[PDB]
Amino acid sequence: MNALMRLNQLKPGLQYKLISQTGPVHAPIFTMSVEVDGSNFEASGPSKKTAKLHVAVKVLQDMGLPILTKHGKNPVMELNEKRRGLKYELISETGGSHDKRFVMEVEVDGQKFQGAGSNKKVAKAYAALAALEKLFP
RNA sequence: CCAGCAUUAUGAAAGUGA
RNA sequence: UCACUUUCAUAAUGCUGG
């Protein structure tokens, strides 16, 4: 329902610009503008985040209402292609502020694999690649 | 700033049907 | 060429924890 979500669904990669910040520090007023379809809209909001919603709203009103495998593919597809339904499992997660390492584990019916990464998605992929490289090719 | 869960849009790969 | 299901990558939004 949000303007920022919708508007960006329809106008990907769009540049919002801050043109002014007025008012006292404890009660700031931000104003953003954007050009779309040749029209420039300007809206203001209490913060930078919202000022944008307010503009995107105004726009919508006008309109109507990476790690890879030799096969050159991500492993987590390949994995699911060969053993459809494999389950992955978070084995370690460390930190909670800046650096965070995750260590997942996928066992192939009989063989198991593990991989660490900064994102869970990444730690998971590495665990796949390893299992794949090691068993299939 | 880092991370997690969820929804929506675009892209790719695998299977089924016409 | 169209529809449905699974997986992944990118983006956006919402909330939570740090």
Numbering used by the authors: 403 to 467, 519 to 590
Publication passage describing the model:
Nuclear factor 90 (NF90) is a double-stranded RNA (dsRNA) binding protein, conserved in vertebrates, which affects gene expression at transcriptional, post-transcriptional and translational levels (1–3). NF90 (and its brain- and testes-specific paralogue, spermatid perinuclear RNA binding protein, SPNR) consists of three structured domains followed by a C-terminal region that is predicted to be natively unstructured. Downstream of the DZF domain there is a nuclear localization signal (NLS) followed by a tandem pair of double stranded RNA binding domains (dsRBDs) separated by a 52 amino acid linker sequence that is predicted to be natively unstructured. To better understand the RNA recognition properties of NF90, we solved the crystal structure of the tandem dsRBDs of NF90 with a synthetic dsRNA.
To further characterize interactions between NF90 and the shorter 18mer dsRNA, we co-crystallized NF90dsRBDs with 18mer duplex RNA with 2′F ribose on one strand. Crystals of the NF90–RNA complex showed improved diffraction properties when a shorter construct of NF90dsRBDs lacking the NLS was used (NF90dsRBDsΔNLS). The crystals diffracted to 3.5 Å in space group P312. In the structure of NF90dsRBDsΔNLS in complex with 18mer RNA the two dsRBDs bind either side of the dsRNA. A slight deviation of the central axes of the dsRNA occurs between the two duplexes at this binding site, suggesting that dsRBD1 has a preference for flexible or intrinsically curved RNA structures. Each dsRBD has a classical α1–β1–β2–β3–α2 fold spanning two interfaces with the minor groove. The linker region connecting the two domains (residues 468–518) is not visible, consistent with the prediction that this region is natively disordered. A short β-hairpin bend formed by residues 519–527 extends the classical dsRBD fold at the N-terminus of dsRBD2. NF90 makes three base-specific interactions in the four minor groove interfaces contacted in the structure. In the NF90dsRBDsΔNLS–18mer RNA complex, 10 bases separate guanine and adenine bases at both recognition sites, i.e. the motif is G-X10-A and the bases emanate from different strands.
